[PDB]
Design a protein around this nucleic acid. Structure first.
Ligand SMILES: [N]C1=NC(=O)[N-]2=C([N]1)N([C]1O[C]([C]OP([O])(=O)OP([O])(=O)OP([O])([O])=O)[C]([O])[C]1[O])[C]=[C]2
Lengths: 159, 206, 50, 221
DNA sequence: TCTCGCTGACCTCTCGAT
RNA sequence: AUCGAGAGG
């Protein structure tokens, strides 16, 4: 019982020395996130308007659009109200295909500005900290697992 | 999950066949599925995409994007023209299109425009063609060329996890992340992709 | 001299070649350096340690 | 929206092992799908014949030497593992090798059997150094697919790791094809390297049959 | 105030000789 | 068991 309640790796999100998260993407995951969210000038598929992150993923898999193409996507984001309820906001944001694809694993309740930049190690650490502060424990562990999977996959694809 | 989202799993597959079956089905669903969607549109108010109309909340880019989001089924016409004239106060909805026998709309409650002033109104005609896959308007090259999403799939993804049967540990399990636009059942879309792939190699089956 | 030896063997002088993913057949987006490195097996087998 | 069906248009035999197979009438985007699927199936699930057990009269275990033979028994087992044969009758067959006197012992020295065909009778198994020495071994050949280690399920028999698959290398390229006046079609050119045990056209047929057998599960509900 | 003893300085594996 | 000589983290 004490192992499950205290020593589980899921209960050990934050470091004891300081409030910074102790589990953090590193090495391959960081490189994958940095490859996805970085942009390039005159990449294939630049300037196309997308109906959502799923269309960005479809164009990436089809080879029609590059991962660094600066496109315009329709993103729906949620922000917590005064009572804590989630209210959606839909707008067209200047972003890339990689950031749009990455937005699919971001949980509800976080701004789109977290992924709308070249994500380094510090950026991912801050994103995980923000997710923990806003949502809680289980959303943070799910988000960390998804980030690790996506980083590994796109670091493999990056070559 | 939904009428457009479904999960199918095949656990007893041999080692290495997950990345074969899932990849082949994903490619066929993404690039080879037949379907009909909006590919062209002409608006009286706006001559070009860069020019912006007055009296409508949504810009021309938003109108083209909503037209892309529209999912349509055509019975027996390769290319069909749908016309929409709207008046009054309220959002422009896909149900406002004049009904045609050969043309059906899966989701009537699809907003194309939002009307701001009752003085201004738009009369628009959209061209729907049957095709396969996703062809961008840039490659296609006052006619507004909008991207056409013929393939009914909205998102397809596969993940390979090891599943162990008694005495065998290298067997692979395949799970499918399948998302459709509502034109056809995602399971039936998987069936169509499998049928297409099987018919491709019929000339080699012993 | 390494570049010249690569030239004589009809190989790219950069030491990197275009690789394709085995599971999907999709070309990797960047050239990957590929070559022959002398690998050693150390006396630290897992069965001796488990 | 009818789909074209690829046809076997050319099977080129560069050598006894190296071959090229061409699939001309393929739609756009189908060439890479078919190439990858067929390459994976050919590299994985092609059945073949390999040596399983070896019994030598004067040998008790692998970690020994036989007088008059330049090669160790372990090296002889590796050389017998590197043996390619074809059997039409049944999966299990026993081959006997006998030779005396100075000179290399090649795959031609195995006794002739109607069913068993040695594709490469040139490669050597062992060497005999002096005239008085003789070699006498019984080779067991079975049919299977994949890599079955000897560790996975008498004195004097030597288990050998079975590299059943006869396919060494697979490379596929997709190029443009001109059918009628259409230029959107492409052709798939599959390149094979084997040990000579399997027929490239038969390999293609087997791979496609395996693919269809796997796909029929998805076809059904 | 300054010499002058007394104090202090994670885990695992292999081998042989007593 | 203890000691000596190594080695890995
Ligand atoms: N208490 C204690 N005393 C020691 O003398 N050593 C310890 N612990 N370690 C442990 O092992 C880690 C570094 O080893 P190494 O070889 O992996 O070096 P490295 O830089 O981390 O990686 P690499 O070898 O790839 O360059 C280090 O933290 C520690 O836990 C190693 C020596």
């Amino acid at each position: 019982l004490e192992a499950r309640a205290l020593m589980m790796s899921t209960n050990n999100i934050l470091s004891p020395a300081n409030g910074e998260p102790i589990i953090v993407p590193s090495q391959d995951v960081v490189l994958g996130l940095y490859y996805m969210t970085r942009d390039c000038v005159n990449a294939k598929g630049e300037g196309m308007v997308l109906t959502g992150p799923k269309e960005a993923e479809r164009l990436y898999r089809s080879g029609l659009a590059s991962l660094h193409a600066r496109v315009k996507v329709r993103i729906t984001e949620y922000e917590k109200d005064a009572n804590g309820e989630l209210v959606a906001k839909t707008s067209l944001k200047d972003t890339t295909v990689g950031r749009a694809i990455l937005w699919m694993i971001v949980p509800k309740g976080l701004p789109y500005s977290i992924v709308n930049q070249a994500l380094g190690k510090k950026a991912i650490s801050k994103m995980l900290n923000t997710c923990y502060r806003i949502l809680g424990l289980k959303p943070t562990v799910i988000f960390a697992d998804q980030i690790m999977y996506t980083g590994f996959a796109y670091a493999a694809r990056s070559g | 999950v939904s009428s457009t989202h479904a999960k199918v799993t095949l656990e007893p597959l041999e080692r290495g066949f997950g990345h074969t079956l899932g990849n082949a089905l994903r490619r066929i669903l993404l690039s080879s599925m037949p379907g009909c969607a909006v590919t062209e549109v002409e608006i009286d108010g706006v001559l070009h995409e860069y020019s912006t109309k007055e009296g409508v909340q949504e810009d021309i880019l938003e109108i083209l994007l909503n037209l892309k989001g529209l999912a349509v089924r055509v019975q027996g016409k390769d290319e069909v023209i749908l016309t929409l004239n709207k008046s009054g106060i309220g959002p422009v909805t896909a149900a406002d299109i004049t009904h045609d026998g050969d043309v059906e709309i899966v989701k009537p409650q699809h907003v194309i425009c939002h009307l701001t002033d009752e003085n201004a109104s738009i009369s628009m005609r959209i061209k729907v063609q049957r095709g396969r896959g996703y062809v961008p308007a840039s490659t296609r090259i006052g006619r507004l060329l909008v991207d056409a999403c013929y393939s009914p799939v909205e998102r397809i993804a596969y993940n390979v996890e090891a599943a162990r049967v008694e005495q065998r540990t290298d067997l692979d399990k395949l799970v499918i992340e399948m998302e459709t636009n509502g034109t056809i059942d995602p399971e039936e879309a998987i069936r169509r992709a499998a049928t297409i792939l099987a018919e491709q190699l019929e000339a080699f089956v012993d | 001299e390494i570049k010249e030896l690569l030239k004589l063997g009809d190989l790219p002088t950069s030491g990197q070649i275009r690789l394709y993913d085995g599971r999907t057949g999709e070309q990797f987006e960047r050239p990957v350096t590929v070559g022959y490195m002398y690998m050693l097996k150390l006396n630290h087998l897992v069965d001796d340690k488990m």
